[PDB]
Every structure is written in C-alpha cells, then in structure tokens.
Amino acid sequence: GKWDYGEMEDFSVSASGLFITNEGNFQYSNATLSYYDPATCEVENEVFYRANGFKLGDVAQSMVIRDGIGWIVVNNSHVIFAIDINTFKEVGRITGFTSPRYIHFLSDEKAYVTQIWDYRIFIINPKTYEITGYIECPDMDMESGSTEQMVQYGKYVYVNCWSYQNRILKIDTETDKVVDELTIGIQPTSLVMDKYNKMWTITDGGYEGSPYGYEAPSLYRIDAETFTVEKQFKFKLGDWPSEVQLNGTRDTLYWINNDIWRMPVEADRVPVRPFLEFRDTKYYGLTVNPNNGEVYVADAIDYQQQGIVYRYSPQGKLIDEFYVGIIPGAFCWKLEHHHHHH
Template identity: 50%
Template sequence: MNDNAWIDAHRQGQSDQLLSDAGVFIVNEGNFMSGNATLSFYDKATGKTSNNLFYSTNGLPLGDVGESMSILDSLGYIAINNSGKIYVINTETGKYSGKITGLTSPRYIHFVSKQKAYVTDLYASAITIFNPVTFQVTGNIPTPGHASTEQMVQIGHTLYVTCWSADNTILKIDTENDSVTGEIKVGTQPKSMVKDKNNQLWVLCDGSFGGTTSGGQAELQQVNPETGQIEKSFALNSDNIASDLTINAARDTLCFINNDVWQMPVTASQLPAAPVLKNPGTIYYSLGVDPDNSDIYVSDAIDYLQRGLVYRLTAKGVPVDTLKTGIIPGFFCFKQ
C-alpha cells in the first residue's frame, strides 16, 4: 500500500484536530535504523503536548531519524535523515500534504522564496534544490570536497552554509544563480550558525565531538560575512557536547549547549561566568529559543532509549513547564 492509500484508509471517519497558532513542533529523532522517529506538538497557552502526531493523524510512521522541520506559510517540511525524504504536513491539522524524495540524507531546509528551497545533506556532496509548491526536486548545487553540509543563514542574496564532518568551512552560495561563490575558513567542524542584529554570523564549531576529526577545539566564533574574517573566538569545553547555537528574539543574545545551557550577549568580550541552566548530570541534547518571547526550550535525551523530556524556561532561566516527548527530542520548530 502506498502512502496515500495508507493515509486515506486511516482517515476514514476522522475529524480534523486544529493545532494552536501558539505552538511548537518537536521533531523526535528516534533511534538510528529503528524507524521510530515521531513528531510532537506543544501548545504554549494550555501546556498540552500531543505526541506521535504524524502517525495519529495520518496512520503513517514518520521514518528513520527525524532531523529538522521548517515552515513556509501553512505547510511544515520535516526532513527524515536516514529515510532520505521530506514529509510535508499542514501545520493547522498535522495532515499529510505530500513528500519530497530522491534525497540522500537530508538535514536542514531553507526557503529562498515561495518557489525555491534548499536542503543540505550529510553525505551527498551537494545541496538539493526543490520547489516547495510542487514538491519536486529541480536541481542541485555541487559542493565537491565538502561531503557534509548543515545549517544555512541568508544575508541578502548570499547563503552561508556550514560544512560539518571533518571540515572547517562555511560555503558562500549565490541564491540567484545557485552556485558556490566562495568559502570562509573557521574552526573545526562548524555545525550550528545564526545571524545577529548587526548581520554578523556566529558559528559554533564542535571540535571533534561526534564527528571524524580528532583533537579539534570546540569554539564559538563571530564571523564578518563581508570580509570573511573571524572577529571573535571563544574556546569551549571540548570534553562536553558543544551544540545548538540559537539566538533570542531581539537577535542580541546567543544561547547554546556546552554540557550546561549558556547565554551570551553578542557584544561580550568573554564567556559568561555561569550558565543559565546547570546540567544536573543528564543529557541536554537540543535547544530552541522562541522567536516571539525568547523562552528557552531544552531537550533531555535521558538515555537515548526512553521517551525524552523538554524543559521550558523564560529568557532569564525561570522554569515554566516540563513536557514528555518521543525518543531523542532533537529539533524545535515554532509556529509564528
């Protein structure tokens, strides 16, 4: 049975369940090769969490390793890494709207326009171009010598892309002609990246953690996108996970994981003396900051086998809520 037939059979007799406009989608990775990725939805106003949303709405498993999710208008695009596809849902109902296939190992999605989107890839040595309206792949941007492309930030017509595994490069891509025009060298294994209020890039390089490079230093770096120069560099603890660089609503304060959860103004000349959230001995796995009110969402993978937790805090670190999700909550996508 194909996806559409499976979904039609499941939906018979079902009524639509509307999802709040004030909510957060949580992509739960699941375990590699287990096909148990799931999607949760958290209603910020009521505190209600709907788990296993994709399956309960569509009767279809999400797939193998849920990586990320991005929203364009009323559609949400969910990258399923090891399944090599992107599922598309209606963000008001959670219903299946289509899928994008022919991908190797999709990671993150960036919308250049309403008719063009890019998706990075862990293994393809190329960035795939697809049409968000037709769900068709329309081309690719070769990235020879850079097998692993990750997060994307656009400034003007230039897209900046981190190259992660065993790499130290940010690629520059012309979004008008879909070509690589240059590169910026940064620290070891640049992964997450944000743009601040001054159009400066901030990149978190995880060093050797989780990749194939040995002996690299974990660093937080400020990069001038016009000159390609590293303006600031802060050494992080390379013995712990350094990941998930995010930024607040005003785009003047960074937030990231380095075992604990840290906040730092973009004007800072040194790392903060204390974290905003101390790690009690668990696994802080992923981080999201609400683009509306700067609330902090931190996931706890616990042991990578049981269902995870998410802690919601105010921007000042005051606890608001704790919710239970699926296995390995790995990505937050905020409805706006």
C-alpha cells in the first residue's frame, strides 16, 4: 500500500490538523507526507503524491507553515516544496540546495535554509522561489559541514551544527554573518528556546567507529543572553539521543533517549521516570500540541516497516495511535489561529 492511487485526488481537509513528514529509507526515494485530523482521529497517508501525482523524493526532513503555505524540506532531493495546506497541491518549489535541513523565516522575502555537506547556510527569497545568498560558517568545509535547527533571540539566530560538528553558532540577521560560537559535546541534534530565554540542545554522542568522535551524550541548558552553558546533563555512552521539543508555553521540555523524557524547564534534575517508556522499538520524532499539550511520538519501529505515531495526553495517557509512512521523523502543526508565545 503505497502508490496505486490512480488519478490525483482533490483534498479539502480540516482547518486544524497535523502534518507528519516521513523520511523514508535514505537513497530509496520513498519519503511521504501524512496528515492527521485530531478531531476525527483519522490519518491520510501519501497525501503529497495523491494530490500532485508525483513523489516527494528522498528524506523529507522537516516542514514549516507560514501564511497558508507549507514548506517541506526534502533533504536528499535538493528541493523545498511549497504546498497549499488545505489541498496539498504544489504552489512552488526551490531547487539547487546541497542537502537542505530546516527553514527559518525572517520575512516574506527572506529565510535561512540549513544544510548538511556544506559550510554555508542558504538565504532564500520565498516570495520569488530563489536562492539569494549564503552565510559562510567558520571552520567548516563541504566534506563534513553541517548546520541544523534554528531559534531566534532578538536580532540573532542561533543554529546547532550537527553531523561531525560540536558547536552552536550565533548569526546577526542584520548582516547575515556568524558573529559568535559555543563549543559543546559532539553532534548537538536540535535546538529550542524556553520562556526564560534559555536554549536547550541535546547531543547524539556520535557513533562507534566515527572519525570524529563517540562519547557520552548530554542535554544542555544554555543562557541565550550570555551564550554560556548553565548546566550539562550527561547521559551514558551508547545512548543516541535526539529531538528536544517544548510545549506551547515553552515551560516543559521533552526529548528522545530510548524512552521519551520530560522535565520542567526550571527543574534541577531529570525525573527518574520517563514520560513514555522504551518498548524495544525506535522512537524517532516528537512534537507537543502548542494549544493543549498533547504529546505525539513518532516511532520508526525498525526503520523498515510502516511507522506509527502515538498521541498521549499531557498526563501520559494514550489517546490514539495511527500508522503513517516509513521513518516518520518530524511534525508541523496546522492551527486555525496562529499560535505564538512569550
């Protein structure tokens, strides 16, 4: 059950819903997009292919919604697609990226797109669907370059550098230049900013046999104003953590480290018990509903079969679970009233 869908389908879905990107298997070009309606507990799978008649490509990595348009990063296809969020039809695309990762909008005419296998962050004009410039990251090359997730702090964007890197970088958006850096443990995976302007990042520890490193990974709380580590929470060699995520008021942190972990951002210590216990599968993506705190956990299972998403209440009770595509890795909320918080 994948592609025998016939003619293009005309979708008209709920004003409120949840996109799930599915990476597919790297180099097989079987990435897909799913759309879940939390009010009816119904999922639609392969919706980009069904609406457009052609496939997304290889490693759908992330997605952002802005002003009615969803922007889907297809990491191993050199492309970002822009789709209508109600019909899933393509409205445009930007090609020419080395290996794009995440998108951060500064205006209708300016966004940053991070990359792997490149030392540059690409600057785009989303209104004209063009690459307009580059930010050169210091002490990075094409052979092992990596920039990943982004958060904004005033006029600055902070970005974690993931694969074969060990830094958070600070970008002045007024000049499009890196102006500072912070070295931490190897391979920070993700980055969020809490309501107290503390950034959180968690590293993956590298891997056995890596030319760059293999070490016990850590979660870090970093002060954004002074760009300094406040506390390092070190885990165990052989753990491979990922994906810090916040709730909608940016006061409760979740992440993946076999189990799903949860901590108030004010806490001194990680709780003894996780939010969701490891079950001998592969928890791989994570999000929190910004309005009601429900926690969604994407499980790749074994990286081969169809993955599943679990939907839990903020108190840890299962609400629903639904099968998606292969290696579901990221989420994007479609909310009727745009949620922001400070």
